[PDB]
Amino acid sequence: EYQNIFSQVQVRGPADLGMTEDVNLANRSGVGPFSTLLGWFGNAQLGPIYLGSLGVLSLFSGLMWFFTIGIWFWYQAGWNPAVFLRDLFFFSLEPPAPEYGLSFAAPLKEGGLWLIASFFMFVAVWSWWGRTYLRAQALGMGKHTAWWFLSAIWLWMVLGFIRPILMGSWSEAVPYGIFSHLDWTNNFSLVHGNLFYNPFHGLSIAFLYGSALLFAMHGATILAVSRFGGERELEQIADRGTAAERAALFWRWTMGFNATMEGIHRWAIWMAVLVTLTGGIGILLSGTVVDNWYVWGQNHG
């Protein structure tokens, strides 16, 4: 009856300071603390973390983005902490009105702060992307993580940058607020004739559902063969074991085809990549090429 979801007995040894390869060791922190809590489910060890100039840039900008939104919120709360907590999900840092187009001439309280916040976000995200590339390179690894991250950045860029530019104003971009950005999302669909008629929205859902399907399948499969060392996937790729064979045959016998220990991760990365890839396409086409998806669907064109 043991299912290997939570560990029964945790072991700890000396802190693992990691592989060196071409990493600049001067930019690595010391190891952080060990969490017994985390250790029931994953690794207990926190850190070390690599923090070079590009990482410091990214973190600083991220915090500045976060703090810029926060300061606006406090202002909206009248600097009252009770109102701040009460109305937290209701505050919103909104982009410039359509009148200001794509210019940076809007006042601080009427779009200017939104532009400042967005600049910090832009720098944070893109510097984090370079860092994702560079940490892989220092370890001699492939750039798959950076290539995937680019597909996610695509949707984000379309929503806040590329689409607004193509539509001729920052007013088209997403506001920074919990409820407000949900309101924006709902409105976006209403104004574009219901996104359920956008074929790329449909695809995006297929892949989003499909990612849950696939990770349920894969996660379950690997736990099911963990009694044969199944989760040691790199060595199973290099030297197929009974874990890998039983995993394949479960699926072969169930649905008539199967994967390999390596190839399932290609299915994985692509399922997830295609969520934001098709998504960004669907959003970018909305209002630039297609004003109304229902109308488009009736044609189709």
Partner: protein, 240 residues
Amino acid sequence: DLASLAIYSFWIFLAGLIYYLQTENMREGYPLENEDGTPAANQGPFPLPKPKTFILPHGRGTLTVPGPESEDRPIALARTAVSEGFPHAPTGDPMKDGVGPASWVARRDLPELDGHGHNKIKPMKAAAGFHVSAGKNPIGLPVRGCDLEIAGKVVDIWVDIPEQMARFLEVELKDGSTRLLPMQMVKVQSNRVHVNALSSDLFAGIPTIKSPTEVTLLEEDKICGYVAGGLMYAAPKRKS
């Protein structure tokens, strides 16, 4: 219309992607075989991919796939029917012969290495700095099989050093020898370790390892397959 061109182009892309993904996933186990081990007439609609070569660390060589597949071991099973598609019966003791859910693969008879080229799995007593950090420490507990008899006692954890995790319990038997039991196949309780997969009389048959301080990938596969096999093959000995 640009959206029409986009969606049309996307479906063409998706078909090619699926074709690519399927062929990538034929790098093990293909070409398909008949039950007698000869090549099957029907290989499906996907051709084998062009080979790739993995360069293995620590002078372990390379792996090129797809490549000539062979089991590299005798398989003690025989047909139960005169036509294709039926089960194959063990010709001896399937636990001893390593077939069915007791199967193992002829993996490399060397241990998995960590990134620094040291053995990935070691007994905790030889693993410097390693200790139990939380949960019930199983070392010293009696080990009970599915027949509700004591098969032995826990004398160490085997630990994954890089991933800081318990991987096997080492159990000493009545004769003073020891066996490894996969950590995923035991239940640590306050007063015992219980093993549902095996009855007490089957512990002696757990494949032994050659060295006291390391386990090879071949050894792990034999141990793990054997223990998993008991769920099917020890069922008449499993008290309910």
